[PDB]
Amino acid sequence: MMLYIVFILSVIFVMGFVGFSSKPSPIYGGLGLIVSGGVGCGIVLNFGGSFLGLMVFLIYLGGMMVVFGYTTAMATEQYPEIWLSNKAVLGAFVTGLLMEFFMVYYVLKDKEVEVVFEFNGLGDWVIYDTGDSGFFSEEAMGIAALYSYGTWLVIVTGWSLLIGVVVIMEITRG
Amino acid sequence: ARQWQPDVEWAEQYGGAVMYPTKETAHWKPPPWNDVDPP
Amino acid sequence: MNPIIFIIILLTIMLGTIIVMISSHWLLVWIGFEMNMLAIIPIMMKNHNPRATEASTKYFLTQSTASMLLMMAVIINLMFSGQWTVMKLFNPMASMLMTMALAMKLGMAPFHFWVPEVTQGIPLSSGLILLTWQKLAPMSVLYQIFPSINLNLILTLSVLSILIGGWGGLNQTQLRKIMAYSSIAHMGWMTAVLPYNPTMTLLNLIIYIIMTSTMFTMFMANSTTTTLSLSHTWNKTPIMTVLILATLLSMGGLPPLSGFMPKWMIIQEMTKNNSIILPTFMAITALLNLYFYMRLTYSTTLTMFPSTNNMKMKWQFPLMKKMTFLPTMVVLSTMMLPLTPMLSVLE
Amino acid sequence: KFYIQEPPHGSPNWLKVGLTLGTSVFLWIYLIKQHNEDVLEYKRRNGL
Amino acid sequence: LQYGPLAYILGEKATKKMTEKSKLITVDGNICSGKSKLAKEIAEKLGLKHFPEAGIHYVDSTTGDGKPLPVQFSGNCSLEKFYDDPKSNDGNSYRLQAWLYASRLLQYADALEHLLSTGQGVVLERSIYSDFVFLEAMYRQGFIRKQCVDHYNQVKKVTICEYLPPHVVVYVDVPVPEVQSRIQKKGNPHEMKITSAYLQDIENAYKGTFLPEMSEKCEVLQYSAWEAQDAEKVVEDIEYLKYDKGPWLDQNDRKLHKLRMLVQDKLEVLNYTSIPVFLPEVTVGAHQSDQVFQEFTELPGRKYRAGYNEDVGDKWIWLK
Amino acid sequence: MNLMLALLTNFTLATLLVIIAFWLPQLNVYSEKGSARLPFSMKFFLVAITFLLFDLEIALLLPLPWASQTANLNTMLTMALFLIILLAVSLAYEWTQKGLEWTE
Amino acid sequence: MSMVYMNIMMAFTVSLVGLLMYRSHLMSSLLCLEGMMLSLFVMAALTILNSHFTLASMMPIILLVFAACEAALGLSLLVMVSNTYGTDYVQNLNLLQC
Amino acid sequence: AKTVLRQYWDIPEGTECHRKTYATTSIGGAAGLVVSAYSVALKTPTSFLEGVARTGRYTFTAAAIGAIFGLTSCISAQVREKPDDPLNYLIGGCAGGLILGARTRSYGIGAAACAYMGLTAALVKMGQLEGWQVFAEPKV
Amino acid sequence: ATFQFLPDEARSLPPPKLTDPRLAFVGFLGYCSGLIDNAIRRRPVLLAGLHRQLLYITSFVFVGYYLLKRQDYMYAVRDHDMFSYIKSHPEDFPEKDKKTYGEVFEEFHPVR
């Protein structure tokens, strides 16, 4: 059901993580992270975070992950190794999927599961808020408050980014 | 006899990669004097 | 490095630390650590060689991992209390994660492997920052979250650090590795007393920093990084050999020198809490540190090792390195015990 | 002229000397003023 | 304002004082090649500062009153002993060589500090780049041991890597028979004991190793003995050089500031010339070095830092 | 639901066009006729890294249209200009340090 | 807790184990580090959005910005390692063994 | 470790020998497993089977010491009719030292282990009798 | 107070005497630093730069005085807090009934 969309997305989220965390060729590992990023944006979208969802796409996938792929093509892997060709990667990949499937199957059968800690399995919709009728996005109000409330945050964030530029020019000059 | 002071043989005890040689660290060598390894 | 850039990078290392110390918000604490780690890397890399690049990479991986674990602890804390205030955490799993993260940042055993290697691979001035200024921010967080730390975890880390630091230093001829293992041992005393009296943690931290700065500054003065190179000091700067002797004995905790004061006070606080076995075990184990401190005094000050002929050329030139604050620090490093009651200013 | 190269500390740095002594004098005057002000505030607050 | 980061920040950048006349010239050659005379003429004609070849007492010339010090304060290195008894069991042969490389290293630092501080070029006679030809000759003739050569290369490896090579290398090529004739004419009794085989070794190292190596990174000019007599033509050759090689093209103010901070600090210059490698030729026992150091501190104007020696006329010590 | 359907249609059609573009009748009956440093300048790394850092700054400027609706306009305008000026200082630093050059 | 939290924490654990279990490529380990950041971003965003903590809505952005700057530093170290040895293999970074 | 240590310290001394020996064998085995884990992690075995062999050799050695200490110390207390006696633990600790002198085959190690593991075991019994705290709870 | 070296309430305490023995020791430490400064730079130890040696003493004394002020204030606060707490909770700090040694029984342990 579409009532479990958030849960389903989080299942794919984990599968993408078991994908690159098993560490295949950095080219394929990058693909697994890109898929996870998109699935992660969808999870954030369904909780009412449109801007935060699109920042993952704009900045995390279009920004950082592009530079990761760019750097991989330059200084790491130019041609991928066959995926799951190494036994260690396959064992790790299979093990994570087997663990994940058991969690999913048990939480769906009992509508709850205790994997270390106890979780509910009724669906994530149950915790949602029931009274919204404002003429604005609350997430947008909060982020816009960076410029009124967050003067200190802007100063230290802006400073760190400038120092990042200076630092990386020092590191790479060699 | 004048006071004994360390000789070269005594000094070289402290010029190795480790203080206590073992089978495992036999291949260790002291690092470069200026910390630079050749390219 | 351009001197103005060096200054700005150094000021950013300090600012990252200060943000951690003045922050009341976990996010700003995390930012302070991130800013601090960003600025420290260039000073580790500044001599451009494979050893420096390996040291910076090992440092980056350790610190970035620890900072992710810290962020995870903060977020778990947010879910179980709905607030960000820097104070006791409201979840035992969050407390463990934050404690482990701060242990990794401090280089406490069994997360210690990076300290000897990173310190060896960077210049003396960079190692001085790494082993002194860089301990301030993680200690200042432990100072605030200790009401919720797991006692068994923190004391296990302390005991392991004193053991690993003492044993690890016995096998070293490189001065930078000796200071690294010495740092691991001293972090153990700082955290062992934290559950009982955090003021003694501050006292041990301050005295540790003063003594460590004195050693590094004296090593820089003569450009010495090995035991044998240090053993030539007697034939160039005899005064330095005496200052090293006093500082090493102080670092060994011998009375009536300054370095005895932290061990003295920590033992007192622990016994007041009916902790008798742990202080005694700690004090005996610290004799391992005293041993490899004494070895250095033997090859530096109490005997005269062989020299070289080219050393005579050095006789004709004076020391030109800055040695900033060295006269002040060496006096504090050795002659402070009569002023022990002054520790109350740290309350 | 004994030295073949003029030493960096052949002649005193009079500006540094003047600042050094001037700084020492200032700290002593400030310290005695602070102590005097502390003693009076103490006597006043305790009624002595 | 003694040079440092503060002076650099306030505008003391090397590129300001440097010109296309700011060049480092080294004159090389076998023994008795008239390279000393050529070096002086080049310096006079090009308006450069001339450095006489760094000998056993070069460091004495730069410190104290500048006059030479007794021999024991140079470790008892004797060039005359090298000729009379090159195989002495006391190790004088390599001890002299190790001392002379350190003397050249110090001189190269002085010359570079002069070039970078004032902008005036300099002329040297041999340098740390060509010092090895004498080491090769010594080893091939069996005067020094293989271990001494290994020690020399260790010291050279961590020292020469810090410094820029000369702008112009000048070689005066004189054949060994002509070298051997000029030596017997010079009438120095110890030098006449030099043998042609040793001289041929110096020549081979110069042509086999030095000149090919410096050609990659410097401007190399080679003159026969006759051509060196025409100093004006030699100077004319130098001024028409393109300078399209070597690291001097990569330098900028930031790198030259780092270089100037090294060369001005002489102890930092000589740091690795005393690496703790216990070679019998250069190792000194504690009792001897202790005794000699104590005598050195008793020499006039040596007990204290320069300017703090009342025994040689320093005043205002209590305000310094 | 509509956005999901649009996305599913767009990439499903793209997939169908790609596969049919690969598998079409050919009318032939005979046999048909690694992870190192790529030789690529460090300059191209610095462009990508420079883009990333500027992109992170852009993320912080994106809320500006909403921030201009605040009553704390004095603070908001000061902080907007501060961030953009710092971005300009970043560019000035790369520029004057020859980080934007393609020679050598 | 809610069902989604089970998988988000699982994703963080999976990437942490991936990070602590190195293979050969340094880039593969840097990807795991970004994976932990992405899971932290999602977990923080979900918690903040569901609780309607309005002013905390900017926190995930700050997390993203700072961690991307961290990743840029990490990549720069990787290329310098690759320039030295011709690969980004961690086994080459063992000089400080002695 | 909490629960295993709770089973052991709940059984009265000198009685229920088989339960005491099980508790120490589990304690000893766990210590052996921890040592194997770090040993295999930090000193990579040349092969998969060498690493498995090392894990068994260490774990069995540690379980052997744990078993002998529990049995010998419980047998002594039972036979002597002295439950609250540190001597029984001193006897069991030395027995463990001998085993460590046998698995490593070194009379010197066995003699040193028996004295030091023997003394350590006796101090543990004294601490239990008198309430000595290793990780003392903060109180002042 | 809050992040205050010497809060306003510290002014009610007698200041340290300028002849405090601890302050004399602090001045002595500054003098020793001045001599070590001469020694490490190979100047005449006792005579060189008396201006520099004077500032070493003055700096130590100046900082030492304020540190001693804060030290005494903190100990005064410790006592203030302790006594106020003993008053607030008289039930936990009762006056012990004292007996003389004529009434108290002590076992005797002969040394023979």
Ligand SMILES: CCCCCCCCCCCCCCCCCC(=O)OC[C@H](COP(=O)(O)OCCN)OC(=O)CCCCCCCCCCCCCCCCC
């Ligand atoms: C006040 C309350 C607190 C009490 C705690 C105890 C305080 C003592 C610790 C103070 C800190 C150490 C300061 C020591 C200053 C040393 C200065 C000195 O004594 O002379 C050094 C001497 C000078 O040699 P030189 O440079 O050549 O000048 C003379 C020309 N020959 O150099 C030499 O000639 C080399 C000498 C050979 C080495 C001999 C070493 C044995 C003497 C050690 C003296 C220092 C004591 C250190 C340990 C503390 C002792 C309690």
Ligand SMILES: CCCCCCCCCCCCO[C@@H]1O[C@H](CO)[C@@H](O[C@H]2O[C@H](CO)[C@@H](O)[C@H](O)[C@H]2O)[C@H](O)[C@H]1O
């Ligand atoms: C209160 C504490 C009580 C603790 C009691 C501990 C008893 C331990 C007894 C160990 C006795 C020997 O202790 C140490 O071990 C070895 C045995 O391998 C001894 O045997 C020695 O024999 C020969 C010498 O000819 C050499 O091979 C070598 O020196 C060593 O093996 C050493 O001389 C001794 O340094």
Ligand SMILES: CCCCCCCCCCCCO[C@@H]1O[C@H](CO)[C@@H](O[C@H]2O[C@H](CO)[C@@H](O)[C@H](O)[C@H]2O)[C@H](O)[C@H]1O
């Ligand atoms: C060379 C020497 C090296 C250092 C040796 C250090 C020895 C230190 C002594 C060991 C610590 C004391 O040991 C510990 O004491 C407490 C006493 O409260 C015991 O406390 C026990 O009491 C009750 C009943 O008695 C038990 O039901 C319970 O399981 C447990 O709480 C612990 O079971 C014991 O583990």
Ligand SMILES: Nc1nc2c(ncn2[C@@H]2O[C@H](COP(=O)(O)OP(=O)(O)OP(=O)(O)O)[C@@H](O)[C@H]2O)c(=O)[nH]1
């Ligand atoms: N063993 C040794 N002797 C050296 C070294 N440098 C110079 N000499 C000696 O110094 C002496 C004089 O040096 P030269 O300049 O070459 O002779 P010169 O005739 O006076 O000068 P020119 O005519 O220019 O050649 C020679 O006998 C050399 O052997 C050296 O590095 N090692």
Ligand SMILES: N=C(N)NC(=N)NCCc1ccc(I)c(Cl)c1
């Ligand atoms: N946390 C602890 N165990 N110790 C502690 N700080 N106790 C508070 C008691 C105390 C002691 C000295 C002073 I001066 C002051 Cl004002 C207060």
Ligand SMILES: [Mg+2]
């Ligand atoms: Mg000549």
